[PDB]
Amino acid sequence: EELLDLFNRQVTQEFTASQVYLSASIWFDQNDWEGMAAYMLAESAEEREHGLGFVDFANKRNIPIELQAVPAPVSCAEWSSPEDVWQSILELEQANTRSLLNLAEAASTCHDFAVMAFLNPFHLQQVNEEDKIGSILAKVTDENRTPGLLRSLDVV
């Protein structure tokens, strides 16, 4: 069952993204970027809510779920500026999107209309999310060209 495997992989991906957001929050806080840290923290909670949403749907639809390990976040070992963090987060969101499109493709092949329906708001949410991050990343890489200026904008 490709569809079942992909659905389980989607849950893991949501919780993986939740932990990576959490890792970003930690790096920001340790480096005194409290406004960015709070943003990443809120995003960590929202990603977990997505995973929980997929778990609930799967239970109702009899798609057997088994929780996999949530891997330790790795990018954080090499972040050295807010630009590096935001870039990893963009890449994370790009991967979340492909991971949802993969799942949709599998559902489409199986003619699974209920799964396709369930995924629609997540596809639209990902469009908004990639846009929002790509646009914070533009602003960060523009303001970091003047020493200190980026800080002055972490002022939430």
Binding to a copy of itself by residue 1, rule CB under 8 A? no
39 is in an annotated binding site: yes
Identify whether the C-beta of residue 40 lies closer than 8 Å to the C-beta of residue 22.
yes
Q: How far is the CB of 4 from a copy of itself (least distance, A)?
A: 14
Using the contact rule CB under 8 A, the part of the chain among 2-10, 79-87, 88-96, 124-132 near a copy of itself is 124-132
Calculated CA dihedral for residues 141, 146, 148, 149, nearest 10 degrees: -70
Angle at CA of residue 17, ends 12 and 18, nearest 5°: 95
**Closer to Fe ion at the Cβ: 41 or 141?**
41
Binding to Fe ion by residue 96, rule CB under 5 A? yes
Binding to a copy of itself by residue 131, rule CB under 8 A? yes
Binding to Fe ion by residue 47, rule CB under 5 A? yes
Tokens, residue 24: 């970003």
Q: Which of residues 28-87 bind a copy of itself (CB under 8 A)?
A: 29-32, 34, 41, 48, 52, 55-57, 59-62, 64-73, 76-77
For residue 80, what is the DSSP state?
-
Nearest to 47 by CA among 73, 11, 77: 11
Q: Which residue's entry shows tokens 């050295």? A: 80
Nearest to 65 by CA among 109, 102, 106, 12: 12
Binding to a copy of itself by residue 138, rule CB under 8 A? yes
**Closer to Fe ion at the Cβ: 47 or 154?**
47
Q: How far is the CB of 145 from a copy of itself (least distance, A)?
A: 4
**Closer to a copy of itself at the Cβ: 80 or 155?**
155
Counting Cα atoms < 13 Å in the Cβ hemisphere of 66 gives 1
Residues that bind Fe ion (CB under 5 A): 14, 47, 50, 96
